[PDB]
Amino acid sequence: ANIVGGIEYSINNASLCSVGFSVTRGATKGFVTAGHCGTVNATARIGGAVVGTFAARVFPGNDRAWVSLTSAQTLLPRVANGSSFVTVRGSTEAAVGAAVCRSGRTTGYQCGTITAKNVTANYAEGAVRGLTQGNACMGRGDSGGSWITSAGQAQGVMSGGNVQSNGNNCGIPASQRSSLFERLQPILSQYGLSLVTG
C-alpha cells in the first residue's frame, strides 16, 4: 500500500485510526500514529491487507506509537488533502497563533490555528499531558492523523478533542473547539525515527 498521512488503517480488524507520517528506523519502514490506537504487536491493515504491526506505544501519559511496516510498503512524504497532497518538508514546530491543518479518515482535511500548548486531556484511561491544542475540527477515527502546516512542516498526530454527539466538533464554532495533538518531535527522538520528506 502507499503510505500517506491521513489515510485510514484498521487495528486487529476492529478499530480505525488514521496514518500520521511515514518514517524510517534504519532499514525499517514505519508510520507514526496515536498510542491509543493499538497495543504493541496489534496488526494494522490498509485496504484489507496486513501492512505491519504496532512496534511501540505510550498511552496514556503521552499518546504516541509507531507501526513497523513490511518491506512491501511504499513510504511517501505526503499527507492527503482531498484528491491532492501536501508535501512533508520537515518538522519545524510552529508557534501559538500559527495556521495548521490536519488530515484523517473521518473529517478529511481541516484547518484552523494553534491556540495553546502543554495542554492536559483527561481521557477515560488517564491523563495525557503536553498536548498542543488547535481549533481545526475533527471526529472519531481522525486519531493518529497528521497535523501539518500548509508549508509542509509536520507538527504532530491527532490525539483527541471535544467531539459532540454527532462524533465530531465540526458543528460548533472554532472558538469552542479543543482539538489536541501529540507533538511529533518527542516521538521521533523517543523511537529514533527519521521523517520521510520531499
Catalytic annotation, residues: 36, 63, 143
Q: Which three cell numbers stand for residue 50?
A: 496486513
The shares of helix, strand and coil residues in the chain, as percent rounded to the nearest 5, are: 5, 55, 40
Longest Cα–Cα distance of the chain, Å, equals 45
- Sign of the Cα torsion 25, 28, 33, 35 reads negative
Backbone gaps in the chain, preceding residues (C–N over 2.5 A): none
**Grid coordinates in use for 5?**
498521512
**Cβ 67 vs Cβ 191: under 8 Å:** no
